Amino acid sequence: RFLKVKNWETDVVLTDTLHLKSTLETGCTEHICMGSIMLPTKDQLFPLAKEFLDQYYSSIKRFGSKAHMDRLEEVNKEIESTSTYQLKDTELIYGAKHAWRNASRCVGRIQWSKLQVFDARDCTTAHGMFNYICNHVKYATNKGNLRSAITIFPQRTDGKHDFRVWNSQLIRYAGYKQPDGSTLGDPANVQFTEICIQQGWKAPRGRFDVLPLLLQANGNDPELFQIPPELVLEVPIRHPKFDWFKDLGLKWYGLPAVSNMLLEIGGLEFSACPFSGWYMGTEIGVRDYCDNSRYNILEEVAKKMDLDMRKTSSLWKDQALVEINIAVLYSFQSDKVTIVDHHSATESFIKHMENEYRCRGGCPADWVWIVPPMSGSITPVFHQEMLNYRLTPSFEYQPDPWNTHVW
């Protein structure tokens, strides 16, 4: 019931109690671990509201005060009367920060209390959503000095009036299947790109076309908008030693802004809650650039480096991988766009875990996601035991809107 995690590099042992608060389920049982699987009414709502308000009033050292009891009463009356309820601004801010705090898959959570929350609950139309989103983009981008932010659209009601951003990130590149056989642009986004085209976007059909936003207000049919190009900060990718690197024609965008997740606070569901922080270098250089199913550029880079691609045991992939990642970091830094390397980010996270154990009694963490996709055991998180469990408020996955939406 009280659980120990050990760091095997430093022998530091932490004791977890926070897991006993855990409410939602993991996918695992006593008979089978699913640790590596990517995706494992009135009656229901009041317990969820109560649990949330309890922790909120606890956090401001007013647990069991008249202000606490009154609010519980007030929300209870509102649920009974209206079958839903509204969060005070203070509760919404607390809820959003805590959803990030509780994100077991996020290595950047040392930052969790510095999150700018944009309340867009008064939004009613897709043009309105576009306006809020451009404002988020500009605020978060901050000319390269990136700031963490979330923009929160109205909560689900009867679920036939959902707000959704159809995009997976606010800023992403299109992907096109070619008449010849290959893929141009980002292969991850072929189906979304097609939806845009079918809805009427005219694609310039290049390798790096910033997708248009596809915005759905109030359960309505989604609409297209182009983010003003001037709000999209992009970085040309060069290498501090290899002059030929620039000729590869690689660029990436500065702002990682995830827009397809669902924020759950006190039982309320925010189906449109685009949020943004800043990149860890490996996301672009290892995953975006080198996944065989992504831009998949390892082959081309190795050639330019004139490496022995005959045998896997020359480690040519590994050599080229490192160079690509040096170049990503160098390019962002040269252009003064916030980026974090995997050594710095994981070291920060170890510190954050220690803070959380010390101040909160634990920190849910998913080792499979937290350890970087390159150089795992030379980062301290590799050697850190982690306990994974589900706390609310939370960010959750939801099915892509096009499989759900009734036109």
Token readout for 284 is 């672009």
Residue indicated by tokens 């036109």 = 407
Judged by CB under 6 A, which stretch of 74-82, 192-200, 277-285, 354-362 contacts ligand HEM? Answer: 277-285
- Record the tokens describing residue 267, joined without a space: 């039982």
**Annotated catalytic residue 106:** yes
Q: Is residue 160 within 8 Å of residue 221, measured between CB atoms?
A: no
Q: What is the C-alpha radius of gyration for the chain, rounded to an integer number of angstroms? A: 23
Establish if 169 lies at the interface with ligand HEM (CB under 6 A): no
| CB neighbour list of residue 318: distance below 8 Å, 6 or more residues apart | none
Choose which of 209, 283, 323, 356 interacts with ligand M87 (CB under 6 A): 283
Q: Is 85 annotated as a binding residue?
A: no
The one of ligand M87, ligand HEM, ligand H4B, none whose footprint includes residue 139, by CB under 5 to 8 A per kind, is: none
Which x/- pattern over 29-48 shows residues binding ligand H4B (rule: CB under 6 A)? -------x-x----------
92 binds ligand HEM (CB under 6 A): no
Give whichever of 274 and 277 is closer to its own copies, judged by the CB atom. 277
* 183-185 and 149-152 strand pairing: unpaired
In this structure, what are the phi and psi dihedrals at residue 47, rounded to the nearest 5 degrees? -55, -40
- Token pair of 275 as six digits: 């949020």
From start to end of 109-261, where are the E strands?
Answer: 116-119, 149-152, 164-165, 175-177, 183-185, 213-216, 223-225, 234-236, 251-253, 257-258
CB under 8 Å to 54, separation ≥6 — which residues? 63
- The correct pick among 5, 137, 150, 235 for binding ligand HEM (CB under 6 A) is 150
Which position among 100, 278, 323, 356 bears the catalytic label? 278
Q: Residue from 84, 141, 148, 331 that binds ligand HEM (CB under 6 A)?
A: 148
| CA–CA separation, 129 and 110 (whole Å) | 29
Contacting its own copies (CB under 8 A), which of 14, 255, 371, 391?
A: 371
Residue of 376, 397, 398, 404 interacting with its own copies (CB under 8 A)? 376
Q: Give the binding site for its own copies (CB under 8 A).
A: 3, 5-6, 8-9, 19, 22, 25-38, 281, 286-287, 290-293, 298, 312-315, 317-319, 321-322, 325-326, 329, 333, 341, 343-344, 366-368, 371-378, 382-389
**Residues with a known catalytic role:** 106, 109, 278, 283
Annotated binding site for heme b, which residues?
106, 397
